[PDB]
Design an enzyme around this catalytic site. Sequence first.
Site, PDB file in Angstrom:
ATOM      1  CB  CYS A 163      32.832  38.421  34.770  1.00  0.00           C
ATOM      2  SG  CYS A 163      31.678  37.182  35.589  1.00  0.00           S
ATOM      3  CG  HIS A 298      37.927  38.315  38.216  1.00  0.00           C
ATOM      4  ND1 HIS A 298      36.919  38.832  37.423  1.00  0.00           N
ATOM      5  CD2 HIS A 298      37.356  37.336  38.958  1.00  0.00           C
ATOM      6  CE1 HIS A 298      35.789  38.200  37.684  1.00  0.00           C
ATOM      7  NE2 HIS A 298      36.026  37.287  38.612  1.00  0.00           N
ATOM      8  CG  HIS A 333      31.442  42.019  38.674  1.00  0.00           C
ATOM      9  ND1 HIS A 333      32.536  42.355  37.904  1.00  0.00           N
ATOM     10  CD2 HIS A 333      31.160  40.725  38.391  1.00  0.00           C
ATOM     11  CE1 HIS A 333      32.897  41.312  37.183  1.00  0.00           C
ATOM     12  NE2 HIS A 333      32.082  40.310  37.460  1.00  0.00           N
TER      13      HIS A 333
HETATM   14  N   LIG Z   1      40.275  43.652  35.986  1.00  0.00           N
END
Ligand SMILES: [N+]
Lengths: 405, 406
Positions: A163, A298, A333
């Site tokens: 990620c 995040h 995401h």
């Molecule tokens: N972010």
Amino acid sequence: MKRAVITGLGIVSSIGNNQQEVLASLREGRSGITFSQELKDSGMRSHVWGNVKLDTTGLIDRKVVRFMSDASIYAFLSMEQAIADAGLSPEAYQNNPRVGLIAGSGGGSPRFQVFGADAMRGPRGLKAVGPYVVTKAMASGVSACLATPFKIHGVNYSISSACATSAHCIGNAVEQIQLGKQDIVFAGGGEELCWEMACEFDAMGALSTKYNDTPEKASRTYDAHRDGFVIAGGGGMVVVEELEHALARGAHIYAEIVGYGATSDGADMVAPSGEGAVRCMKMAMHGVDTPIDYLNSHGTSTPVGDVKELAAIREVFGDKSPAISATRAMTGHSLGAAGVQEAIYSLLMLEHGFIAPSINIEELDEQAAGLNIVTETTDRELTTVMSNSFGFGGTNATLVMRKLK
Amino acid sequence: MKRAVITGLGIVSSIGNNQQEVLASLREGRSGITFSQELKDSGMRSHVWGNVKLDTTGLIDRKVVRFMSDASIYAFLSMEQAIADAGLSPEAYQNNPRVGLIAGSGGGSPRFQVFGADAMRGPRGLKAVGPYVVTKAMASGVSACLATPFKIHGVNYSISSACATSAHCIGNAVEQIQLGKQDIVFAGGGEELCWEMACEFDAMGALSTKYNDTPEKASRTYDAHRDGFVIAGGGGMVVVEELEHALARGAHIYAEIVGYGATSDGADMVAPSGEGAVRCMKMAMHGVDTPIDYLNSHGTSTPVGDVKELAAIREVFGDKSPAISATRAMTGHSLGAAGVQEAIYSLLMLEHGFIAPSINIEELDEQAAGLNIVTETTDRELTTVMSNSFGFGGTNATLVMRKLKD
Ligand SMILES: [N+]
Ligand SMILES: [N+]
């Protein structure tokens, strides 16, 4: 040493095929999540995704696209937009040793790696596989598929860190400018969206599975009823440029990258330690003489993860915490593309003076107590913004971007 | 202006499971290539590979290895060796923000990406996939599976650039040192060996297919009858350390990384341009005023590629061509693990004073005339060595390593 600025950007995401469509989506808090028959048919439990709504047919020359997986296609389109947006022409960036490209994906191409094996196990074997599967699969597909057609002569590779992928790409691009090795580095990444890869996350219990009937509400970062993330696909690219080089050609400068943090948790394989995030955020703020006005968190809409970052944020700022929103609530995401897409959402907020809303929060989580989580599109004169990207393997990246003086 | 030196190495390759076994193989010109029933049964035309001859079962804690694909295992085992070789106790490198890890693979884990999909399409669906496929299949698997168990707190990510992968990992580690951001960075890579990935190469005609009956003869860089590379797997790791930090703790230093080139061809998708390689080697040689005594070539044993590299070498060195050997003729091509493994073979040659032979050259390619390709083990005091890694997508990396005084 040298300073680095962003002089152009490009993006293909679940909420828009270019910066204008994305800007519109962000201001209206529009969700890019839809129901996915493909995921349901595959047997998954999560039936939703942040799909790229774009017919890419004929957008890329056949001889170029024949080598590409979707991650590369998305990154390629994003780079085309960023080049134009930067006001760059072939004469300036092609066949130039001082122009590079660092762009990656979190998963390469599980779809083509699986197509390869399926085809090879069929009666036609190698003939069915074809000569194009290595560049479509292969972890460096995104950098390889773009460097060649764009005639890049400088640095050329892919960084992957799940990620945090494209956030590390941007940061490494910054380091190249600081080391005096490149005047421009295109940095970003892309990620395909497919059941082949999505199922690995579902098998992990990481994807939302309770909101299949109401797609737009599945990604709900910070909401007490969050049950995992919504997977997304997409691409992003920013032009990272040495400052004097940029000023000298009259570039439009969105911002200067004044901080880049990259740390490691050295703890859990899938959940964040928080201690790593604290250090990463601090590394990125080190020497930055201005306060953080906005933080694109995040927060992927998971139970522990969301809580871990908030604690880290409290530790870093205390009571002086910045405005916070998780655009993931509307976008999903995008894994490998997340870092650059979020750095872009953040530059658009910095550029257009507004904070996108953290949507789908029906009941704030007890952990987000002493913090300012923005839940409605808010107009504000931002100067310094921060974006966090934390991936599996305990890898952390934070980017701090500031308007130029 | 911080300097970076190599203070420890570790390796798992087709020609040895540690630096001692590898040293012996190199000196003996011993091939690590064998016939592979797995490749043949898969339907491939190439039936040979540079396999790791080691059963890794139980060498890694069950709760750590559960997240790992073979590239991570090879890299992990390599890093254990590197840490012991560098003399680093846990307290010296664990939970230390100035200690990082940059390691990657060229392909991640095609075997596990395919396994997850095969399982998912079966009668158990998600239950057959299991919760460990992501960390096995993702491209950053190598860095993620090592950073965690080794308690790494500094930089943590993977670079991927096909055959140049681990060489860029090493160069990037040097950059962290030069930026004053890290005192130590473990750099390396790993690559699994499986038909799932190998057939892709065979499907584009990149693999040797005419020598399956004589596996040890298939990899023959510079030989007139070469017909493609021999795929291999394995791993490698080196400890890149800031010089002052190495000297203060009494570290044994193999060499200083005095040059690192990273360039891009921006030409052809699978064939080298030669031009990028020339710039890459020249960039690596900037400010290196000692001659290159030994060059470990990229030469993967392909018709086109071997010669583009020789031409680039001719252009860079002209009249001062160094001794050259392709260890690849012995090892096969380990893709992501190649850059670090060849940097290690180069360091072993530098440490022990010998040049490993470029084997299997029965008929030297015409375009190699006039170069000093070493085909027999040769003792020689080396001081400065170069190793090239030029991968698909036109990505290039060159590393130059030099012995320090005393
Ligand atoms: N972010
Ligand atoms: N090499």
